[PDB]
Amino acid sequence: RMNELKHAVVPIDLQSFCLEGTLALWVPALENDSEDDNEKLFKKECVAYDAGVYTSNKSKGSQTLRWSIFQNRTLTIFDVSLNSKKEPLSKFNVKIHFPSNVMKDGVAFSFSEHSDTTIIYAITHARVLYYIRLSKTWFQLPDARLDDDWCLCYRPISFLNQKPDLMAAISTSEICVSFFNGGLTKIILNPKDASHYEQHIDDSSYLFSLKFKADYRSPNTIISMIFLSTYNVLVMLSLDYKLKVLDLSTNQCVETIELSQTILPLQSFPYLTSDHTTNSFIALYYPDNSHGSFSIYKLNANFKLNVVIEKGIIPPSLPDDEFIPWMLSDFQLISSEGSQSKFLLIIAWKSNLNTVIQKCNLSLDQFSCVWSHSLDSTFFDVPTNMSSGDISEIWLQHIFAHNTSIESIQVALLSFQNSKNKLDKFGALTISELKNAVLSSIVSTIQIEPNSDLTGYDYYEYKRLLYNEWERFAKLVAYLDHFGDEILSINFDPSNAVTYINYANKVAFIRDPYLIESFDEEPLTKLISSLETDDPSLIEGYQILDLGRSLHSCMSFSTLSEIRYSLRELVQDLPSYSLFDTLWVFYDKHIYPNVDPDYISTLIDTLVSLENPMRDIDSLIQRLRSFDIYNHSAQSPSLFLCASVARVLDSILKKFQVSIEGFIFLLSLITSQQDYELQSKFAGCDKLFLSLLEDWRLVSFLLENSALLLEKFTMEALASVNTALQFFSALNYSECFSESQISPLHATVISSLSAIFIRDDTENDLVTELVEKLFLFKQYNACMQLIGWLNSDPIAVYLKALIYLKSKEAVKAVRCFKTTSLVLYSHTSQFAVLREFQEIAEKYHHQNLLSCYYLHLSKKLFEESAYIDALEFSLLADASKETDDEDLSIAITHETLKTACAAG
């Protein structure tokens, strides 16, 4: 048994982070500064060659920043904080331009307690050292103010003859830099006069414990180094496999250990890391013939410091196809504070653009290793019905919901036209403009031809050629964007619970699969092998689920699209036929023509063989929708959190929808069979079916929210978010109050899922709740797009009316106004759309409520300049009184005057 790891991926572009723009900066210029095509353009501009995330773990609260460096002489910084702050939202990233490329391993961070500022050390290929002070303002406010002293430039003397190779920030004024051919300097800066000096470090390893060319490398050359605290200590590994402890208080080597011997070059990767909790443990990597092994060491301090061993070997599991090579990219180490017996080692493996992440739970026997890993790796016929629209609609949806970067689309778009200038021009396009530009440019290249006896067009050929052009474009986009999938680094964030994974144009984090995920991806055998169990109905439930899965897989994209339109119709207009007439019609139109007679018989017979199948799937369906609830939070989530949650939700909801559909298909098949014992075994399945239809509804509703782009003109994120699903995500923002080791990411997802599936008579409808909030935030288009999901409850119908009213659909609004009443809702607190009605209801002592409603309507139609209806409702308010109230009578006749006069 080996658990699976999954990740949530977010592209590093403005759109995915809900950013409004970029603060562009240029470092001060100095004297010796110094220094096919579309694919190279993408690579040069958008595919980072180094990256990481730094957490300022002591601020209020922590800022978590993701840096990347590109061959266009830039360093970009994105705020990737998952925790809520007391601060304004990050609506901007920063892009810093350099006269020369920042070197690999040439970016280092440090944080000052006083003045609450983050520092970046950067070294370019030209060997200039830059000292950059970050203002939080840069991320928050447009065209932010630059302090004069934001960038200081240094030209260290040791850089003239020696090539800087690795860095380790010691503090906000001190940094160590090791050299490629050997040696180590400490650069010490005085930020308050722009001057500096160095300290030559002699690598004074007096003793070690145990048991010719101009281009040439000394055995003491640093090949990996890390800074620890509150030991003023540097831990270094040498070219000749010596583990050294450097005391930074005295600049002397205090301890040295010779390690074992093997050839280690010429692949370049980190060899050392320390745990983030107590800088006291050290993980160390040993290359092998087969992936290597890992050691852990304890650091003991009294002056004299000891590096005492704890582990000789931690052997990684096999990466997949070992006739192609795999290289270590990076790794992290985490001890669990309780106490120094339990450790966690996260490892990232690289093979060109392929990647594997492994976790190891190691523990001490006074050892055991529990391992987990990630198993990381589209077509449709020309539409014959319009349930999901035509070729362009479908391809456009697919390309823009694919989790590829915006840049890959922009660069791909260039190729489908006639230019570095043009790329920057596309960057000033809105996402909708980009979508339109993609569609426009594809539609413009495809020509429709006459056929055949010149009696019309060849519609068939047009469709095929249009499809193929879209396909080519999608292939180019995926091809370019896949270069951005190269792994570069990983970082455990102790401030959050989270380990960040840094790709060349994407950030990600590790997560456990939810049950629904395990049940989606194959096969039945592996599902069964979950211990022990060793009983039905556990096994038998699984078996029936697979029957649902395999039935679902009988349907093509085109059939599925028709089925979802039928299910939509079923759950939006629930009254028409009886329950079991609908199942029969459904089976007749959608299942029967798609499912083979033998396969029907196969399902019947295997279902009959089960002891109480209905109970079994009932229980499994209960398991799948079962979710804990975390504490709902106050207040604001970061935008990045909302984006992250939305992506995971979209991914989970798709598996839920397919799962629910499989069961619906199954129930529909069963209840149409002329087999007494089968149907006898499912006698009261109507409640199960209705329950599934309700699940389907909410899930499919939210899936429609995923691609729904919001209009642009406490909980600040609600007004700055980009999609309807991110908006939903923000409303369900949640934290684990008792436990820190759980991130607000996992809690928000879980809470959101809980809100979807945990049901009762007393609760309000999720559609009404979400749409009502969108309305309050003036997202009228979103609302209108989603209006067909709102049910027949009075509040819902009233809200349908308000949405139509706002959409200039007066006649539809008025119709909805007259087929509902707010009479039972003069007390309800939950919906702020009810305030205007409830103010009137309170004014008139919750009496004559019909009239109050008609009065409210009158004033509402009046604001929208619908004076005829405002008049009629006023007359209706007058006609509707049941109890004497002079104040109400007066107010109504007042409104009548006001309304009649305005209509003429």
Binding site: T384, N385, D390, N436, V443, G456, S576, I868, A903
Partner: protein, 371 residues
Amino acid sequence: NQYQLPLNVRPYTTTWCSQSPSCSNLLAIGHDTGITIYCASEEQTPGSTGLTLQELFTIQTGLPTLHLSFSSSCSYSESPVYSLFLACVCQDNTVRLIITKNETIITQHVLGGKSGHHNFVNDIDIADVYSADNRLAEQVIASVGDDCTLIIWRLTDEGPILAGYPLSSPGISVQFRPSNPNQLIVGERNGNIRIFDWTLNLSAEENSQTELVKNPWLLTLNTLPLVNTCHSSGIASSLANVRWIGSDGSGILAMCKSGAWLRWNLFANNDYNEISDSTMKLGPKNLLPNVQGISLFPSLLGACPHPRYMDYFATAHSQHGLIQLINTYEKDSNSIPIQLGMPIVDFCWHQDGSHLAIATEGSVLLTRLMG
């Protein structure tokens, strides 16, 4: 210069009988309790040209008529008797064929229940289909609704055959191709325009063997994504309507709610040829609109194409009583020949293109325009 007449009942829609030659001079107003028929009489007693409206009678249905279209089966005879057939949409989401002699309804054929629409019905059209000879073989009613469905209702000698086709969003406008009643156009709310042949599946595949299916969805034209050449930032606009242009349905006019309109010249402006002479020598073209612009005002009701002159359409600012006459051709010369100072409910061209009929909240108008 223009005729006016007050209304006792609140209107919703106005249409001209153009489908029946002998009734080409009457106007229907769909309103709160039914349908009032008016006659356009050429008479003006002082001795001049100038039409007037005579309120003939009111067909009481007991509920609002929202959309309406005259049938060809409409006739006049001699007590003088108007024998009318009306394709109607009513407040209860029903689609109806209403049969009358004057005010009195002999029979209503109602499409509702399971087979009808289950939400607001936005548009309706009727067309005549002729068999082997020029005999009247079928009458066809098409309707589109917020239930994202196109419903075809065929009235055959044998009786009714109906079919429903899913749409990707609400269906806001539907129209049979003039002179080619087997093709129709549907405009969805999201701006996608679809040409649909309701015919090519029943003739070969549906009625018998050997069930070799053809795609009835001939073409999708995209509207919203292709605007901006004039010129709208239009923060999420939607389709107001789409219309066939020309007595042969050679062109297509799409109007967005923002005022942004687009024109395609798809087919030859001619009785026989489908391929336009223009396509024949300059080569196959793409499906980008040929010309586009933006009205001065947002267009709630959409474009009202001139029944005779292809390049001309009218579009109103419904709330403020302005009607702009647009010539597609003819870029940036702005003409607002009609300004009323009160809301417009609906308007349509006189069957002969001389006049406009306009319903406001309190009156119906006839307005002549020249050129």
